Design a protein around this ligand. Structure first.
Ligand SMILES: CCCCCCCCCCCCCCCCCC(=O)OC[C@H](COP(=O)([O-])OCC(O)COP(=O)([O-])OC[C@@H](COC(=O)CCCCCCCCCCCCCCCCC)OC(=O)CCCCCCCCCCCCCCCCC)OC(=O)CCCCCCCCCCCCCCCCC
Ligand SMILES: CCCCCCCCCCCCCCCCCC(=O)OC[C@H](COP(=O)([O-])OCC(O)COP(=O)([O-])OC[C@@H](COC(=O)CCCCCCCCCCCCCCCCC)OC(=O)CCCCCCCCCCCCCCCCC)OC(=O)CCCCCCCCCCCCCCCCC
Ligand SMILES: CCCCCCCCCCCCCCCCCC(=O)OC[C@H](COP(=O)([O-])OCC(O)COP(=O)([O-])OC[C@@H](COC(=O)CCCCCCCCCCCCCCCCC)OC(=O)CCCCCCCCCCCCCCCCC)OC(=O)CCCCCCCCCCCCCCCCC
Ligand SMILES: CCCCCCCCCCCCCCCC(=O)OC[C@H](COP(=O)(O)O)OC(=O)CCCCCCCCCCCCCCC
Ligand SMILES: CCCCCCCCCCCCO[C@@H]1O[C@H](CO)[C@@H](O[C@H]2O[C@H](CO)[C@@H](O)[C@H](O)[C@H]2O)[C@H](O)[C@H]1O
Ligand SMILES: COCCOCCOCCOc1ccc(C(C)(C)CC(C)(C)C)cc1
Ligand SMILES: COCCOCCOCCOc1ccc(C(C)(C)CC(C)(C)C)cc1
Ligand SMILES: COCCOCCOCCOc1ccc(C(C)(C)CC(C)(C)C)cc1
Lengths: 96, 63, 103, 97, 81, 114, 103, 69, 81, 81, 52
């Protein structure tokens, strides 16, 4: 069967595993270029795609900060609501 | 009439693919005959930004 | 629109004119009560009676209500369809990554 | 004693040619070449036949081999591809999705 | 869970009957225009010439919807396997 | 609130249909033709056709055109081009191997995606 | 005789709300694109959706050729040009081992 | 006509009934009905829906952590 | 996933009734055209000659949609397997 | 419990006919407008100019729903696999 | 829809002076009639582009 529910792994672990997968997919391209006997410029033209994918995974990982623990976040956990414990105004803090 | 009769006889004896459908055995045999690469699945549904508007995406699973 | 509009209008007129009838019945002396003396020191009453003032004070009051409470209201409306949903545990930060000596 | 820069009669005669145009004088006179050599009739047929032709070529023979062959055999194979596409044996001879 | 794709070839035709069944409903609207023109000329013969364009116009429009319905039935069969 | 406006004749509709009939009468006036050189194939019953007797009007307007009567016909050879190429393609002999490997716009071809 | 028609486009624009209408139209359309179409379609992370047959039918005049992948090779050429202009090391990314937010 | 949030008045200062008359019941019953009523209808419905979903909120994220053990 | 192609031969014959159901709907329009022409003639006998052309027009042409509603059912059986 | 996912491909082309049956049901209402315009002008020719807007107004709206009914069946095939 | 508009036509031909007083009803009859067609149409399009 199937179910609509929560994500299995945390965001940080998900991004970590994605970065590892792109590292593998880039290492394979690099090993293949080395087996073919390509130079630096040809290796660049070969594996620039996987390099950019790895860099984007790294950007996502660096961009995601795990949340800090405090009384407001714990109360939001108890209330089971998506809540930002860094805003005095909510949706208007985006414009204020 | 000649064309459709010949095409029908070849579709019957499986020497030619049916109308509108890509047949696997005939395509693989023709590739082996012409010495060409075999018909693979080059698509990448899990590429970044292909099924973002899809409410029912496809799940990655290492078989 | 719905055809119940005159029904809702009748009910609104009912409650409004009954509140006015109550104010007529109790008559003067409201300023001597404790309710009035507290409303004089109550910020809700100040805001509510400043809203209807002229000079753009309706816009000021509405925008102030938005900026203060309506953002939390928007978040609440977004979280109504989140309370019933299965969510994972919070990946609390270990607060170990980031420290680095200065040089 | 006109104090303004009087414009000659021949200059007015020439400007009248440009400002005495009518709507139909633009619409039909420019739409006939457009409709004939446009995305409907000629250019559209050409440029949309090319797509099917080169799809068929790259599927059957290859673009590199096609470029390596001669212009005559290139045109022959293009004509065969055009016939296959116009026929559309797989769509029931119908140019619809 | 398990996943069984099924391709029902019989469904190439079951819809064609329904599409064919809906072609005859506009025919009443088709004849409703000629009936209207008949009764109109029967009440005012002199106006028969000025209402004939409306009569031809309405016949085509009512007929077109039946004709539009027909496209699905003919498109459902001769291309789909 | 109670403005008491008189009826404005400019807001009525008593000229649009007369004007359209004037335009159509101007159109049909150019369909007038002489008896000499007249011929029209009637139906098998002997009754006239629909499109038949309204070709002279269209071609009398083509006579008065200036550019379209010398440009709009250059897309007509393309019709005969299609008529010929279609007949060439109805019976074109092709390689069975290439047809089985690269069918044009066939379904369930994984190289296309579906 | 002075006229903003022939002597000031600014005062002409200011004195006619029906000249403000196209400018507001332009601003709203560009804001709509910025909010919705920018990140969902035009970004490199979201550009492969143009290869979808449902959401972008025949954007390349045909079904998208995945064996060829023109998007992949174009963008790879561009990233290679970026890498050559920056003199960045390709293999420096592979020497990284990210930690996990333990506990 | 029949506008929204609109009501006419007669010479006696009373609201004229558009659809339904409710001025026959006594003042005590009217005050009983209207002491808790407001000029707001849909917000109470949304609030009851939110309270129902709060009563039926999920606590799996706490079960995984052990707040119920 | 698995793929089971099936050929439902019964659908060759099911659709015949489905199209057949729609063959009688145009009859109401067809008879309507005459039910109009009768009353029109009873309103004005002298105009009977000018309405008869527009009385057989809609007559046969509503039946034409009935014909294409019927031609599918007859094309459904004696050619398909 | 057990779980068998099935993907019925025949419903791609069944629903096309099921919607196609309904495309003609507006047409009988479409012709009502022009019949009304005819008989209303037969009662008063001078008013035929003031009602003709309501005649055109009555067609394009009544015709629209037929088009919307036609959309789904065409939305059903040329996008879904 | 055309029932409402045909009624408006025959009412106007019966009495041209009442052409304007029944025009509000000419609009009110269409708005909350076409709406029911839209609710049905809304389901049919909601039936596909949201359900997985
Ligand atoms: C405004 C008043 C002036 C501010 C005073 C000056 C000051 O320094 O600010 C101190 C205080 C800390 O601000 P901060 O040091 O700048 O930010 C660091 C963290 O945000 C600190 O996060 P925190 O967990 O420490 O939050 C502390 C929170 C108190 O948190 C609780 O008490 C929650 C438990 C409720 C018990 C029932 O605020 C207070 O301590 C007093 C106000 C209540 O300011 C606020 O927290 C603003 C409170 C204004 C009301 C917002 C909602 C408060 C309660 C939210 C609960 C969780 C959300 C649930 C949804 C409902 C939302 C309405
Ligand atoms: C109370 C607060 C109410 C303000 C609400 C609001 O939205 O304000 C933020 C809003 C934009 O803030 P944001 O986009 O969230 O932050 C990013 C910055 O805009 C980043 O841009 P920036 O800081 O580098 O530019 C600063 C400055 C520089 O201005 C100049 O350089 C002059 C040339 O002014 C602007 O550029 C105007 C703001 C940016 C453009 C308009 C808003 C963008 C909305 C999303 C895209 C819409 C596309 C519009 C396309 C327009 C046609 C090209 O600013 C405005 O649109 C109007 C500002 C008027 C300030 C007047 C203050 C005077 C007080 C006395
Ligand atoms: C506890 C109450 C106990 C008393 C219950 C008995 C009632 C006795 C009468 C008392 C006086 C009274 O109720 O005045 C109405 C009084 C206020 O009602 P109202 O004057 O109509 O509200 C003002 C506005 O209409 C509505 O105010 P609003 O601020 O909520 O309007 C905002 C609303 C806008 O509302 C709208 O204009 C409609 C727009 C469509 C929205 C539809 C979707 C909304 C749902 C999503 C939210 O905004 C939205 O809808 C958001 C939609 C955004 C969509 C985004 C796209 O009612 C209340 O006190 C509330 C509680 C009781 C309500 C039920 C009343 C019972 C009705 C049964 C009557 C049967 C006859 C009974 C008499 C015979 C007895 C023997
Ligand atoms: C909790 C119930 C939520 C599920 C259905 C929501 C129906 C709301 C019932 C509350 C009745 C109070 C009056 C009201 O809401 O309003 C009743 C509404 C009319 O409200 P409007 O006049 O504002 O459009 O009736 C309806 O047509 C919709 C309700 C259908 C039942
Ligand atoms: C007039 C007398 C009437 C007699 C009948 C009274 C019946 C009243 C309704 C009782 C129904 C309670 O309904 C039940 O509530 C609980 C919480 O309370 C919900 O449970 C919810 O809260 C629990 C508790 O944290 C969460 O862990 C869980 O994930 C969530 O589902 C159930 O999903 C629901 O089935
Ligand atoms: C049923 O009608 C079909 C004909 O439609 C042809 C469409 O033509 C596009 C516009 O054609 C013109 C061109 C000029 C004009 C005039 C001459 C009236 C222009 C004007 C007012 C500037 C003199 C009118 C229409
Ligand atoms: C059934 O159709 C009815 C719709 O009615 C349309 C009413 O508008 C008619 C406009 O037609 C014209 C076009 C040109 C002209 C003139 C002759 C004034 C053009 C001009 C300025 C070139 C002389 C007048 C009316
Ligand atoms: C801009 O809108 C004006 C367009 O009007 C076009 C009208 O088209 C119909 C013209 O076609 C006809 C039809 C009949 C006839 C003639 C055959 C009237 C009958 C005749 C000459 C035998 C009396 C001539 C032309």
């Amino acid at each position: 069967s199937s179910y609509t529910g929560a994500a299995l792994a945390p965001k940080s672990e998900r991004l970590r595993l994605a970065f590892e997968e792109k590292q593998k997919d880039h290492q394979k391209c690099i090993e293949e270029a080395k087996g073919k006997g390509l130079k630096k410029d040809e290796l660049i033209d070969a594996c620039a795609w996987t390099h950019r994918k790895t860099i984007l995974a790294l950007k996502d990982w660096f961009a995601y900060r795990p949340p800090f623990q405090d009384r407001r976040s714990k109360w939001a956990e108890y209330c089971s609501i998506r809540h930002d414990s860094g805003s005095w105004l909510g949706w208007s803090q985006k414009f204020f | 009439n000649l064309r459709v009769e010949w095409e029908k006889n070849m579709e019957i004896q499986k020497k030619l693919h049916p109308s509108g459908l890509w047949s696997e055995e005939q395509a693989f045999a023709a590739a082996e005959k012409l010495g060409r690469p075999k018909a693979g699945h080059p698509m990448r549904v899990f590429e970044d930004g292909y099924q973002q508007f899809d409410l029912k995406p496809k799940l990655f699973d290492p078989d | 629109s719905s055809p119940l509009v005159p029904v809702w209008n009748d009910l609104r007129a009912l409650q409004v004119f009954t509140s006015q009838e109550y104010m007529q019945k109790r008559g003067p002396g409201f300023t001597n009560t404790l309710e009035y003396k507290l409303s004089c020191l109550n910020p809700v009453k100040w805001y509510d009676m400043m809203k209807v003032m002229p000079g753009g004070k309706a816009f000021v009051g509405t925008a102030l209500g938005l900026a203060l409470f309506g953002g939390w209201g928007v978040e609440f409306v977004k979280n109504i369809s989140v309370m019933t949903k299965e969510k994972p545990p919070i990946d609390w930060n270990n607060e170990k990554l980031g420290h680095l000596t200065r040089s | 004693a006109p104090l303004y820069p009087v414009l000659s009669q021949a200059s007015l005669y020439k400007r009248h040619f440009f400002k005495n145009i009518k709507l139909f004088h633009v619409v039909f006179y420019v739409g006939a070449p457009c409709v004939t050599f446009g995305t409907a009739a000629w250019s559209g047929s050409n440029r949309n036949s090319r797509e099917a032709i080169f799809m068929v070529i790259e599927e059957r023979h290859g673009w590199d081999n096609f470029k390596k062959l001669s212009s005559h055999q290139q045109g022959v194979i293009m004509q065969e591809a055009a016939q296959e596409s116009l026929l559309a044996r797989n769509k029931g001879e119908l140019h619809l999705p | 869970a398990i996943a069984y794709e099924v391709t029902v070839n019989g469904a190439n035709l079951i819809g064609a009957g329904m599409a064919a069944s809906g072609v005859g409903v506009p025919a009443i609207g088709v004849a409703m225009c000629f009936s209207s023109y008949m009764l109109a000329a029967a009440r005012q013969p002199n106006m028969s010439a000025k209402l004939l364009p409306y009569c031809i116009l309405g016949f085509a429009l009512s007929e077109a919807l039946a004709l539009f319905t027909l496209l699905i039935a003919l498109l459902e069969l001769f291309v789909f396997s | 609130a109670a403005p008491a406006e008189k009826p404005d004749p400019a807001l009525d509709a008593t000229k649009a249909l007369p004007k359209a009939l004037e335009e159509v009468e101007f159109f049909q006036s150019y369909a007038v033709r002489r008896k000499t050189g007249f011929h029209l194939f009637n139906r098998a019953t002997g009754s006239p056709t629909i499109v038949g007797p309204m070709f002279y009007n269209l071609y009398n307007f083509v006579r008065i055109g200036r550019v379209s009567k010398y440009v709009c016909w250059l897309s007509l050879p393309l019709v005969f081009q299609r008529m010929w190429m279609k007949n060439r393609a109805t019976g074109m002999e092709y390689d069975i191997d290439l047809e089985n490997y690269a069918p044009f716009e066939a379904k369930k071809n994984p190289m296309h995606g579906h | 005789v002075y006229t903003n028609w022939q002597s000031s486009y600014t005062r002409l624009f200011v004195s006619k709300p029906w000249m403000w209408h196209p400018l507001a139209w332009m601003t709203l359309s560009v804001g709509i694109w910025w909010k919705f179409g920018k990140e969902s379609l035009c970004n490199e992370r979201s550009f492969y959706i143009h290869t979808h047959p449902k959401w972008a039918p025949h954007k390349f005049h045909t079904v998208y050729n995945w064996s060829r992948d023109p998007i992949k090779w174009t963008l790879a050429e561009q990233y290679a040009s970026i890498i050559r202009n920056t003199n960045t090391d390709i293999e420096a990314v592979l020497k990284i081992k990210l930690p996990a937010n333990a506990n | 006509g029949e506008l929204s949030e609109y009501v006419e008045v007669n010479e006696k200062g009373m609201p004229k009934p558009q659809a339904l008359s409710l001025w026959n019941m006594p003042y005590a019953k009217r005050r009983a009905l209207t002491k808790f009523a407001r000029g707001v209808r849909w917000q109470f419905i949304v609030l009851f829906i939110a309270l129902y979903n709060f009563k039926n909120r999920d606590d799996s994220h706490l079960l995984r952590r052990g707040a119920y053990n």
